Each structure stands twice: as structure tokens, then as C-alpha cells.
Amino acid sequence: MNTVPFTSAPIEVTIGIDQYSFNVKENQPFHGIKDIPIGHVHVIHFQHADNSSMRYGYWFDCRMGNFYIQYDPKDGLYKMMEERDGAKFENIVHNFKERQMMVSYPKIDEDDTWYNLTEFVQMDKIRKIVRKDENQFSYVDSSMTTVQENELSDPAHSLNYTVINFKSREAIRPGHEMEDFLDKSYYLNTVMLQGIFKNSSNYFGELQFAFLNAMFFGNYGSSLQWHAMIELICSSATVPKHMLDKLDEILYYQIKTLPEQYSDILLNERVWNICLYSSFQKNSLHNTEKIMENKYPELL
Amino acid sequence: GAMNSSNYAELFNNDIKLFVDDTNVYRVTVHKTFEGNVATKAINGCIFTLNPKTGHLFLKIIHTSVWAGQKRLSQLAKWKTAEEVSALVRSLPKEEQPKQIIVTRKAMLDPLEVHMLDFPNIAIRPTELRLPFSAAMSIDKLSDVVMKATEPQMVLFNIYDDWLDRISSYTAFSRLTLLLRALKTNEESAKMILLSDPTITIKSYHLWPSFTDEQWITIESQMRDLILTEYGRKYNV
Numbered sequence: 001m002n003t004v005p006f007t008s009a010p011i012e013v014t015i016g017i018d019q020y021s022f023n024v025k026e027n028q029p030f031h032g033i034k035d036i037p038i039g040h041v042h043v044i045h046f047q048h049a050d051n052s053s054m055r056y057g058y059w060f061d062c063r064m065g066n067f068y069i070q071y072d073p074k075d076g077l078y079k080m081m082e083e084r085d086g087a088k089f090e091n092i093v094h095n096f097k098e099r100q101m102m103v104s105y106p107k108i109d110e111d112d113t114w115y116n117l118t119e120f121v122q123m124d125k126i127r128k129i130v131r132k133d134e135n136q137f138s139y140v141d142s143s144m145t146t147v148q149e150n151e152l153s154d155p156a157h158s159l160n161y162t163v164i165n166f167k168s169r170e171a172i173r174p175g176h177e178m179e180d181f182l183d184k185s186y187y188l189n190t191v192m193l194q195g196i197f198k199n200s201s202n203y204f205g206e207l208q209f210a211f212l213n214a215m216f217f218g219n220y221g222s223s224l225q226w227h228a229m230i231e232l233i234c235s236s237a238t239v240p241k242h243m244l245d246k247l248d249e250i251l252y253y254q255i256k257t258l259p260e261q262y263s264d265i266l267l268n269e270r271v272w273n274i275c276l277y278s279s280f281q282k283n284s285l286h287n288t289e290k291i292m293e294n295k296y297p298e299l300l
Numbered sequence: 301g302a303m304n305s306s307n308y309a310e311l312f313n314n315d316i317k318l319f320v321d322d323t324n325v326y327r328v329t330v331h332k333t334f335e336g337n338v339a340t341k342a343i344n345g346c347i348f349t350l351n352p353k354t355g356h357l358f359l360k361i362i363h364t365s366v367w368a369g370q371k372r373l374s375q376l377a378k379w380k381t382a383e384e385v386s387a388l389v390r391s392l393p394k395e396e397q398p399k400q401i402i403v404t405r406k407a408m409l410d411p412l413e414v415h416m417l418d419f420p421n422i423a424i425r426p427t428e429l430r431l432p433f434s435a436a437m438s439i440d441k442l443s444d445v446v447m448k449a450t451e452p453q454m455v456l457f458n459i460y461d462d463w464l465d466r467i468s469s470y471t472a473f474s475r476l477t478l479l480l481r482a483l484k485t486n487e488e489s490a491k492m493i494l495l496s497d498p499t500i501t502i503k504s505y506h507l508w509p510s511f512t513d514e515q516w517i518t519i520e521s522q523m524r525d526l527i528l529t530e531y532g533r534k535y536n537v
């Protein structure tokens with residue numbers, strides 16, 4: 001179990017760590033988060049109490065370095081930094097733990113939620129969607145746009161998601177116009193899976209990362225990407241059975257975790273009604289369809 | 301964006317554009333089978349592709365063999381239309397290619413957009429105008445070439461005959477739209493109006509009769525009366 005210490009907490013802020021959130025008061029004696037499970041990526045995220053504009057946060061993996069948080073009063077944000085001095089870091093952490101100045105990561109033993117949301121998410125792939133090679137953690141915020149969005153300035157502040165566009169020469173083989181537009185299997189299996197992602201694990205990793213950025217930061221371009229990656233599978237007549245079963249599990253846990261009061265802004269009615277009720281895969285997502293109908297029947 | 305009454309003069313500017321109407325591509329008669337079920341029999345159709353500035357009509361005849369063994373024909377018909385329009389564009393010299401293609405039905409937008417991906421600079425537009433181009437098969441010479449076709453064929457016409465020698469393309473299009481709306485609302489009466497006087501004939505190389513300017517005014521008035529007459533019969537006004 002690893003630790004992200006904080007130098008201090010000089011401004012009042014709501015701090016998220018994965019699916020949990022808690023409030024820290026201005027100058028309250030808070031020195032970080034302990035007991036972070038090893039083996040998963042994690043995100044530590046922030047919304048200032050005096051300006052809820054800009055949610056921002058960090059993707060990190062404690063196996064890749066010793067990370068800590070320090071407020072910068074110039075740039076006006078809790079900045080994540082790597083500590084290269086290991087014995088300094090261990091000594092800092094041990095003292096904060098002894099003084100019980102840290103929150104413990106609240107993981108319930110039965111609870112696989114975070115695993116289920118990040119099953120295919122790897123730091124190395126996050127570091128390619130968000131490019132800052134100098135740093136071992138990734139910084140994301142509510143306002144960052146995507147490469148596709150910039151087709152319709154510092155490179156690290158753009159999300160390099162894989163561009164998906166159903167009316168594009170990449171998606172449509174000359175001479176198979178109707179076939180490829182009404183059945184996206186070519187675009188899914190040959191162009192995207194075989195050609196770009198290499199395997200379904202990397203595709204699902206990007207889909208899960210897009211969802212989490214949409215949920216945790218309200219990042220609109222990430223929400224667009226999440227839905228596009230769902231629609232691409234649902235609109236393909238030929239999808240490996242293991243991919244369909246895994247997609248159903250992925251989406252179930254995403255819909256289960258989504259805050260009920262954000263469903264209006266985080267869920268696209270057209271995509272979900274098409275995917276669940278009209279698409280080739282309308283009968284292949286039993287768990288997702290059941291939770292959607294019981295939790296968000298208005299949308300449908 | 302969409303083409304409506306606010307931007308009607310745009311049809312007659314110097315930017316090449318084509319209307320595409322697909323309402324006569326897939327045509328059927330519905331009938332009973334020996335067992336008392338219902339079946340369809342396709343008949344020859346046509347794509348109506350019109351330059352409203354010049355009158356040039358690219359009439360692609362859709363022979364019933366293109367439907368043999370296919371499913372979901374009403375959907376296929378939209379994609380076949382888009383394939384043939386794309387092939388037509390590619391066959392034209394660059395300086396003759398349209399800058400815009402206006403589809404008369406919004407269901408043609410995605411099929412045509414996908415087929416024209418290679419032409420990112422050609423705008424594909426819908427229209428809010430309700431244009432009576434479905435009545436094209438009420439023009440006898442057009443219906444005749446479609447029904448006689450034994451294979452796919454493209455035939456080029458000028459739908460304005462020689463009218464542009466005397467009137468503008470705005471006035472020519474308005475005449476055409478009035479004639480077609482009349483033929484669509486009451487075909488028998490419209491044809492009676494157009495052919496009642498045996499002394500006015502249709503030249504071999506034309507589609508409509510050889511009316512003088514003053515006779516066109518009478519004809520046009522008789523067509524408006526027909527449209528109003530049928531509107532009263534329809535709504536009991």
C-alpha cells in the first residue's frame with residue numbers, strides 16, 4: 001500500500017481519489033492519502049471551494065515513482081511532483097503517518113469497483129494520450145480538448161484519443177460504401193483493432209480512460225470519445241463474443257458508478273437508445289441494458 | 301445549410317449545382333398472389349438530376365434487373381442513387397463538376413455524403429422546398445424512355461426546351477415547378493391543358509409544346525387555376 005503525501009492544504013478544496021471525494025478546509029492540517037492499493041492506476045483530483053471552475057487531477061501509478069502534492073500559489077493549483085530522494089520521501093511519509101495526518105484510501109474488502117473501472121487502463125497508454133515524457137504522472141482538466149476536436153499552445157494540454165469518424169475515408173472502403181456505413185465491422189476489426197489498437201485490451205483501456213475523464217472532470221471531448229467507442233462496437237455485426245461479453249461488464253460498472261444527478265449531462269440519449277434497442281448488438285448487452293432500464297429509464 | 305425560400309436566387313447564380321430527386325428510383329406495383337398474399341413487382345425507375353440554371357437533366361434510368369436478388373430495396377435505392385450521382389460527378393470534367401448537390405429528401409444526405417467523401421469541397425445540402433420532381437414521369441417523353449429501357453442507361457435532356465432563349469433561368473424554373481406541381485395534383489387535367497389545342501405541337505427535340513410568349517401566360521394561368529381548383533376539391537373550400 002502506497003502513499004501520496006501533501007506538503008500542506010492552503011486553500012479549501014474537495015479532493016477526489018478514484019471514486020471517493022472528501023472536503024479539506026482552508027489551512028486544515030491535511031498531509032495526504034495513505035493505503036493506496038498497489039496494482040491499479042489511480043487518479044487524484046481537485047475542485048477548489050472558491051472556484052468550482054476547473055476540475056483538474058492526476059493519473060499516476062505508485063509503482064512508477066514516489067509522488068506528492070504541493071500547492072503552488074503562483075499557478076493557483078495543487079501541483080503533483082515526483083520526489084527522487086527515496087529516503088527523504090519514506091521519512092516524510094513515516095512522520096505524517098505517525099501524526100495521523102493522512103486519510104486512508106476507504107476501500108471495502110468486497111468492493112471491486114475500481115478494478116472493474118480500470119481493468120484495461122495502463123499508465124503507459126495514458127502517457128501516450130496525454131504526452132509529457134518528462135513526467136511519470138499525467139495532468140488532465142475539464143477544459144482540455146481532443147485532437148479530433150482541434151481538427152473541427154502546449155501539446156500536453158490536448159487529449160490524443162484515437163480519432164473515430166464514421167463518415168471518413170478511413171471508415172469506408174471505396175466500393176463498400178453502403179456495406180461499411182451500415183455495418184462498421186471492417187472499421188472496428190481491421191482498421192481499429194488489427195491496425196491501430198492491436199488488441200481489444202488496448203481499445204477497452206482507452207474507452208475506460210475516456211469514461212473516467214468524462215465523469216471525474218466533466219471533460220466533454222472524453223465523453224464524445226467514450227460514446228464513439230461504444231457506438232463503433234454496437235454498430236458492427238461481427239464482433240468477437242468475448243469482446244461483447246467484456247463490453248457488457250465494462251459498461252455495467254460505468255453506469256453503476258455514474259452519479260445519478262450527472263446522468264443528464266454524461267449520457268447521450270441517441271447513442272444509448274440506438275445501442276440498446278436498434279443496433280446489431282441490441283441483444284448482446286444484457287447486464288448493461290438491465291441497469292440502464294432500472295436506473296435511467298427516462299433517458300430511454 | 302438547408303435550401304429554402306430565403307435563399308432561392310442562389311439556384312440561378314453561376315456556381316454549378318444539381319438537384320437530385322430519388323422518388324422515382326424504386327417503383328413497384330402491389331398485387332395479390334395466387335395464395336391471396338401480397339407481393340410487389342418492380343418497374344423501371346430513374347434518378348432525376350437537374351441543373352436548375354441550365355435546364356440540363358441527367359436522367360439515369362434504373363432498370364429492374366438492378367433489384368434482382370437484393371433485400372431492403374427501399375434502403376438500397378438510396379445508396380444506388382448516391383452511387384450513380386457520384387459516378388456522374390466523376391465522369392464530368394473538373395470545370396463541369398458541381399460545387400453543391402441539393403437532395404430533395406433528407407434520407408439521401410448520408411448515402412450521398414459517404415459516396416462523395418473523395419469530393420470534400422462539394423457541399424451536400426437538403427432543402428426545405430417541396431419540389432414536385434416526382435411528377436417527372438408524367439412527362440410523356442421521359443416516361444417513354446424509362447419504360448422502354450432494357451438495360452441501365454443515362455439520357456440527357458434539357459427540361460426547359462429552348463425557353464432560355466427568351467426567359468431567365470429563374471422564370472424557367474418557376475414555369476417548370478408550376479407545370480410539375482399541376483401534373484402532380486391532377487395529371488389528366490394538366491395534360492388536357494397542355495395538349496388541348498391541336499395547332500400547338502411538341503417539336504421532336506423538345507419535351508413541352510411550342511407555346512408563344514402570350515400562350516405561355518395563358519397556359520400558366522390555366523395551371524394555377526387547376527392547382528387552386530384541386531385545392532378546393534381536396535379541402536372542400
Ligand SMILES: N=C(NO)c1cccnc1N1CCCCC1
Nearest residue numbers: 075078079080081132135139156
Ligand atoms: N500540473 C502539472 N504538474 O503538476 C502539469 C503537468 C503537465 C502539464 N501541465 C501541468 N500543469 C502545470 C501547472 C499549470 C496547469 C498545467
